[PDB]
Amino acid sequence: DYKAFDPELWNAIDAEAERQQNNIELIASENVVSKAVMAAQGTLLTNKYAEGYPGKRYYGGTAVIDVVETLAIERAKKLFGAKFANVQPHSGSQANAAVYMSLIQPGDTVMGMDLSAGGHLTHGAPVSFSGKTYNFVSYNVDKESELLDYDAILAQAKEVRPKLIVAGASAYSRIIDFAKFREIADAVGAYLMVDMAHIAGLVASGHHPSPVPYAHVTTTTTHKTLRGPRGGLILTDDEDIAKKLNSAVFPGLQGGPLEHVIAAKAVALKEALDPAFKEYGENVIKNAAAMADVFNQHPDFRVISGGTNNHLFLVDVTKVVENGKVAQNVLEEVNITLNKNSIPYEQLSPFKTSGIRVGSPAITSRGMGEAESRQIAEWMVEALENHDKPEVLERIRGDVKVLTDAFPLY
Amino acid sequence: DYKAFDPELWNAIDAEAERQQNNIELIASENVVSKAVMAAQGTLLTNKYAEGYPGKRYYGGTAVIDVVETLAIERAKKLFGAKFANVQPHSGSQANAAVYMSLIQPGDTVMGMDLSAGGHLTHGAPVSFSGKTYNFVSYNVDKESELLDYDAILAQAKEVRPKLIVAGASAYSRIIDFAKFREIADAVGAYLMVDMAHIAGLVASGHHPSPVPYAHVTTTTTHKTLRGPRGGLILTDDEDIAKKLNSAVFPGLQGGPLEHVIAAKAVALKEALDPAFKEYGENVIKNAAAMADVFNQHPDFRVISGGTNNHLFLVDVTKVVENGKVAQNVLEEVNITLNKNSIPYEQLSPFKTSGIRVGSPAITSRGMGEAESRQIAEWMVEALENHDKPEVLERIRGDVKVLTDAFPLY
Numbered sequence: 124d125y126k127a128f129d130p131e132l133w134n135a136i137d138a139e140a141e142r143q144q145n146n147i148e149l150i151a152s153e154n155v156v157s158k159a160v161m162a163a164q165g166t167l168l169t170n171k172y173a174e175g176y177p178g179k180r181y182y183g184g185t186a187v188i189d190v191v192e193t194l195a196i197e198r199a200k201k202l203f204g205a206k207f208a209n210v211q212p213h214s215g216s217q218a219n220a221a222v223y224m225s226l227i228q229p230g231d232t233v234m235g236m237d238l239s240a241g242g243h244l245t246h247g248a249p250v251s252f253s254g255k256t257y258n259f260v261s262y263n264v265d266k267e268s269e270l271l272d273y274d275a276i277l278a279q280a281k282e283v284r285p286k287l288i289v290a291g292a293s294a295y296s297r298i299i300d301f302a303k304f305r306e307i308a309d310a311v312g313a314y315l316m317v318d319m320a321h322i323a324g325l326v327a328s329g330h331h332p333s334p335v336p337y338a339h340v341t342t343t344t345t346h347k348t349l350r351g352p353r354g355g356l357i358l359t360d361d362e363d364i365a366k367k368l369n370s371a372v373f374p375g376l377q378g379g380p381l382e383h384v385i386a387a388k389a390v391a392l393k394e395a396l397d398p399a400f401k402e403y404g405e406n407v408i409k410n411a412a413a414m415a416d417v418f419n420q421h422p423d424f425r426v427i428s429g430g431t432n433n434h435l436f437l438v439d440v441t442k443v444v445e446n447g448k449v450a451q452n453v454l455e456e457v458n459i460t461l462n463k464n465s466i467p468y469e470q471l472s473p474f475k476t477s478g479i480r481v482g483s484p485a486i487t488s489r490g491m492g493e494a495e496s497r498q499i500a501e502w503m504v505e506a507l508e509n510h511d512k513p514e515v516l517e518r519i520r521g522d523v524k525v526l527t528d529a530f531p532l533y
Numbered sequence: 534d535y536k537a538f539d540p541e542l543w544n545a546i547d548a549e550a551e552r553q554q555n556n557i558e559l560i561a562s563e564n565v566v567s568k569a570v571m572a573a574q575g576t577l578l579t580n581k582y583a584e585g586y587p588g589k590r591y592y593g594g595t596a597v598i599d600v601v602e603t604l605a606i607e608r609a610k611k612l613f614g615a616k617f618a619n620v621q622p623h624s625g626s627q628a629n630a631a632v633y634m635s636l637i638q639p640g641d642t643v644m645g646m647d648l649s650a651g652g653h654l655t656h657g658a659p660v661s662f663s664g665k666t667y668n669f670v671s672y673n674v675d676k677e678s679e680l681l682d683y684d685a686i687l688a689q690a691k692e693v694r695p696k697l698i699v700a701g702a703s704a705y706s707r708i709i710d711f712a713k714f715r716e717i718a719d720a721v722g723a724y725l726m727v728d729m730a731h732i733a734g735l736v737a738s739g740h741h742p743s744p745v746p747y748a749h750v751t752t753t754t755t756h757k758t759l760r761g762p763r764g765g766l767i768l769t770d771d772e773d774i775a776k777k778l779n780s781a782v783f784p785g786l787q788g789g790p791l792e793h794v795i796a797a798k799a800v801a802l803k804e805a806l807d808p809a810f811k812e813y814g815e816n817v818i819k820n821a822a823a824m825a826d827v828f829n830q831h832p833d834f835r836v837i838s839g840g841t842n843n844h845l846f847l848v849d850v851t852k853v854v855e856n857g858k859v860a861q862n863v864l865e866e867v868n869i870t871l872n873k874n875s876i877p878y879e880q881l882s883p884f885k886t887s888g889i890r891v892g893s894p895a896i897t898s899r900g901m902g903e904a905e906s907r908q909i910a911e912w913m914v915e916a917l918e919n920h921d922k923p924e925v926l927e928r929i930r931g932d933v934k935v936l937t938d939a940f941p942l943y
């Protein structure tokens with residue numbers, strides 16, 4: 124019994140397990156992983172150094188690690204239909220760094236989605252290595268439709284002449300057209316990288332068309348909709364690019380991979396390969412549309428782009444509260460966790476924002492369905508509308524507890 | 534249960550556990566972590582996004598995570614006597630990247646230990662981001678003594694004018710004079726960074742002098758001698774540098790931290806604060822020295838620098854077998870796993886090398902003492918001397934099993 128040695132730490136772990144059980148987790152980038160995923164991360168694979176790749180390592184006694192890493196790779200290939208995979212990146216951010224390193228040079232120009240419009244930090248923020256090393260020039264969404272305008276993006280690319288175009292987002296609710304992004308890249312001789320971190324589980328379930336046949340390289344996190352452990356993954360169909368990607372991950376950016384986490388990737392990928400995973404995908408789509416629909420009908424709330432065809436959506440809350448930060452703090456008091464989030468053409472400070480981002484994967488992984496989704500959104504509307512009324516929130520909190528007990532986390 | 538859903542994966546996991554049990558692991562960068570460390574990283578903390586730092590995160594639902602991360606931070610500070618710590622780096626390599634990003638600019642000149650004399654890839658190898666982004670100039674050890682020669686290093690630094698000197702190694706066996714390194718740095722107006730990855734547990738146990746009072750910034754892995762989960766850690770006593778390092782880790786290089794690994798870091802740091810860790814360290818030192826003495830006394834092997842004052846040593850094997858790769862493969866035949874390794878002024882190919890590197894931490898963590906260590910080294914000598922006598926190898930392999938049976942891994 125090692126927990127008696129460190130009660131401060133293990134009490135804190137217990138408190139987080141209860142926090143998670145008693146919350147409605149709507150943070151769009153989160154999920155609830157299986158016990159098998161957790162168990163694999165909890166193995167003595169953490170003891171093993173394995174610099175290199177399967178069969179070409181720098182240390183003895185890696186033949187079993189090699190089987191494990193090869194399972195992950197072969198499963199990623201099979202699930203996503205790619206000819207090559209690298210399962211070593213420690214995160215989505217490292218995965219993306221490796222692609223840039225493989226395809227372009229410092230100072231080269233890159234187009235990626237504007238951060239207010241849902242692009243990631245590693246898609247060119249000035250405070251990220253991405254913006255510091257490469258010349259990123261952002262494309263945006265249409266100001267009226269809040270949709271990607273492929274003609275506008277094509278004309279911009281024709282002016283900019285990037286070496287690389289990055290597609291993918293952290294907060295865009297609509298289907299991204301990867302065929303068009305590749306047309307656009309081809310029109311200027313650019314590579315196309317798709318960062319499908321947020322939608323990888325939908326791509327896997329068949330609810331979002333795949334970037335894989337269109338992107339020269341596809342990156343993703345394994346956590347998020349794919350419902351795996353925290354880490355990165357890189358896919359391509361080009362063998363020469365694959366070799367570069369491999370050198371870039373190691374020795375380029377990383378040292379020894381986290382082979383216990385890689386085992387957990389293999390676990391998650393086999394889960395996503397199972398027919399049940401499609402049904403999970405299907406519910407993710409439905410649950411998010413149901414919550415979105417509630418806000419759509421309510422007159423003091425607008426939903427960015429008018430709705431969603433994926434797992435997430437953004438809501439402008441400024442009619443009802445001052446900003447997204449506030450909205451987040453309030454929903455938190457009724458045990459509903461999400462995050463504030465800039466909306467396209469955000470007017471307010473980055474640290475306030477005008478919006479909230481909502482996602483369905485975690486509640487869907489707990490077994491909730493359309494009715495519960497709808498109710499959760501009613502509750503959010505209701506709490507925001509009564510934010511100054513402690514008696515209302517206290518009641519909403521009570522009702523939330525009935526729902527969380529009914530769909531227990533583990 | 535979940536193992537039945539995925540037998541190919543769980544069969545491999547179970548096989549690695551057994552392989553670790555049935556091999557004598559002398560790889561100097563490995564250790565055997567506690568069940569607690571592994572359990573921490575097998576928790577549902579993996580489901581939480583926690584970009585930012587305690588109390589200044591970009592998501593709600595982070596109050597307990599803050600408790601965990603803060604425990605990790607305060608325990609690092611305490612254990613190493615530092616005023617600031619950052620526990621988010623995913624790896625040692627990422628820790629190092631962050632520090633360069635914080636202290637210097639692309640193209641700046643940096644001095645780093647030579648890869649053949651024990652410097653790490655991230656200390657300036659042309660295949661690493663380190664050598665690609667910065668102008669690294671290497672220093673070596675003295676050709677005759679195989680020791681750091683602080684006068685030569687100073688003369689070189691005066692010629693080269695680095696903005697940063699990096700100290701620390703993957704394969705140096707003697708005590709490093711950090712006060713001397715800082716004196717050199719101060720003399721040329723350079724920063725000093727110390728990468729204490731290999732030695733951090735010995736710094737913690739009291740058996741290696743701390744670089745913390747002398748380096749502007751100290752990096753380390755939490756795995757290796759410290760006996761923690763895989764990951765990185767950064768320390769400094771300078772508040773302005775600490776702000777830079779934090780911004781460099783996130784949003785500079787990483788995104789979301791691995792909070793389950795961070796819990797595991799907290800676990801390991803408390804283990805290392807326990808008085809028993811001092812005894813572990815002492816055994817690490819005695820066991821490595823007992824192994825080295827066998828090779829010192831044998832006339833056909835030479836230990837680099839004539840011995841060790843830490844957890845590791847290198848042996849020139851070229852009088853008995855052709856190169857280090859051969860020696861590595863021979864030992865593997867008798868279930869002793871190590872790695873071939875360049876020696877200082879290496880004349881053979883990097884793929885072959887003249888050396889093997891041996892370390893004590895793993896066997897020490899299984900509870901082996903001096904007599905077992907000495908016996909292990911005798912078997913290594915005997916295996917290499919009889920590498921073409923299958924019958925001898927077979928007998929050694931059988932003796933090894935008796936020993937491993939007697940010191941169960943967990």
Ligand SMILES: Cc1ncc(COP(=O)(O)O)c(CN[C@H](C(=O)O)[C@@H](C)O)c1O
Nearest residue numbers: 152214215216243292293320787788789
């Ligand atoms: C599209 C995308 N790519 C890559 C990453 C980085 O992966 P990490 O380095 O493993 O964290 C994220 C994280 N997305 C966060 C999120 O969506 O909650 C975002 C706000 O910064 C992402 O949304």
Ligand SMILES: Cc1ncc(COP(=O)(O)O)c(CN[C@H](C(=O)O)[C@@H](C)O)c1O
Nearest residue numbers: 378379562624625626653702703728730
């Ligand atoms: C001194 C030093 N710093 C940093 C690292 C990076 O750590 P990672 O990114 O967490 O793997 C290592 C790994 N050391 C290996 C080893 O010694 O076995 C080395 C030779 O490549 C190291 O020895």
Ligand code: NA
Nearest residue numbers: 418419421424
């Ligand atoms: Na509305």
Ligand code: NA
Nearest residue numbers: 828829831834
């Ligand atoms: Na000798």
